[PDB]
């Protein structure tokens, strides 16, 4: 069976985002002209939301729940795939091969991923994905 | 063929004071004391020299920017890349094994 | 024996020797069985075990170190893990081994 498919949650082991959690949007098992290797387009969390306690004020609660996303092209050898999954339906049409050739499309994709991740976290779903890995 | 000696108080061949010979603009050979060379920072897990971090004396680090003594990755400036990757993989596998053990335990005292 | 089936696979079937090739074949889903020596490091062994669990690939634990497994393959260099892409003329997959 093949497990590096869309929606698979992985942990980045190499690069600036090492140790951060990403979800695969579009896997490329044969590689492109610019990335001649088995790679995957992923959207991950660069800055996890902070835990909220009942002492926190309404203005503060808003600040602590903010999520900073990132979108990356990652080699398969630099990913550690997990057994968990996460829906990529909300932002599967923005993260494509051309997005990483156009900075404006990259900015728009980051905005869309940020909105989707914040909505999912505020809804209370996928509490493992929005949890920092201790290493 | 001109002979030179120490220019400071220490008259002994100690590691502290070492001499090089240079020709000054006056046309003469003169001694010059050389400072101790700097040592590359080492990784805290395997002890290999850290990559991308400047090699300076202990007090010369306070006068340079953070980008000259760090790496943008996590643990950058403290641990090398392979050690960080090993840490990530080991932590994830340990957590997964903890989950598996907890499930097995929940099964085994579910009998009674 | 079990070494005869491995030798038959080497001679006639399709295989990959080494950790990187085995992981690549598991990622592509082209593997049918992975033989793991007892000498392999615990971290790499656990990662291979997790990968096989993810990809639903059969695992066989070789009764020997990496150099015994290499000799069974017929090579004079140590091999720690082997992936069987195609049994070929052998029958290692059928016998559950």
């Amino acid at each position: 069976a093949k497990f590096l498919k869309a929606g698979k949650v992985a942990v980045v082991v190499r690069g600036r985002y090492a140790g951060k959690k990403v979800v695969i949007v579009k896997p490329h098992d044969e590689g492109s002209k610019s990335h001649p290797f088995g790679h995957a387009l992923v959207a991950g969390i660069e800055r996890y939301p902070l835990k909220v306690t009942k002492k926190h004020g309404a203005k503060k609660v808003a600040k602590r729940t903010k999520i900073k996303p990132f979108i990356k092209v990652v080699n398969y050898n630099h990913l550690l795939p997990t057994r968990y999954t996460l829906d990529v339906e909300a932002f599967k049409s923005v993260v494509s091969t051309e997005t990483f050739e156009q900075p404006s499309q990259r900015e728009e994709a980051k905005k869309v991923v940020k909105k989707a991740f914040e909505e999912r976290h505020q809804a209370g779903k996928n509490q493992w994905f929005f949890s920092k890995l201790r290493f | 063929a001109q002979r030179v000696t120490f220019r400071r108080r220490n008259p002994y061949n100690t590691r502290s004071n070492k001499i090089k010979v240079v020709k000054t603009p006056g046309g003469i050979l003169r001694a010059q004391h050389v400072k101790k060379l700097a040592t590359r920072p080492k990784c805290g897990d395997c002890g290999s020299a850290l990559q991308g971090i400047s090699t300076l004396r202990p007090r010369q680090y306070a006068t340079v920017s953070k980008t000259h003594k760090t790496v943008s990755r996590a643990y950058g400036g403290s641990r090398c890349a392979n050690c960080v990757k090993e840490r990530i993989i080991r932590a994830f596998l340990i957590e997964e094994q903890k989950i598996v053990k907890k499930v097995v335990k929940e099964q085994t005292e579910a009998a009674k | 024996s079990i070494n005869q089936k491995l030798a038959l696979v080497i001679k006639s079937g399709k295989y990959t020797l080494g950790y990187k090739s085995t992981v690549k074949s598991l990622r592509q889903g082209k593997s049918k069985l992975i033989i793991i020596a007892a000498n392999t490091p615990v971290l790499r062994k656990s990662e291979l075990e997790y990968y096989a669990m993810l990809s639903k690939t059969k695992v066989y634990y070789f009764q020997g170190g990496n150099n015994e497994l290499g000799t069974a393959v017929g090579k004079l260099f140590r091999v720690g893990v082997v992936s069987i892409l195609e049994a070929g003329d052998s029958d290692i997959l059928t016998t559950l081994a």
Partner: peptide, 28 residues
């Protein structure tokens, strides 16, 4: 603190569930 073991993953009797990622836990 031991790494992942397939023997313990089989001792639970649920490997399809684990591969699907059913039992999700957060510690500490």
């Amino acid at each position: 603190e031991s790494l992942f073991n397939l023997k313990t993953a089989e001792k639970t009797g649920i490997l399809n569930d684990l591969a699907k990622g059913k039992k999700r836990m957060i510690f500490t």
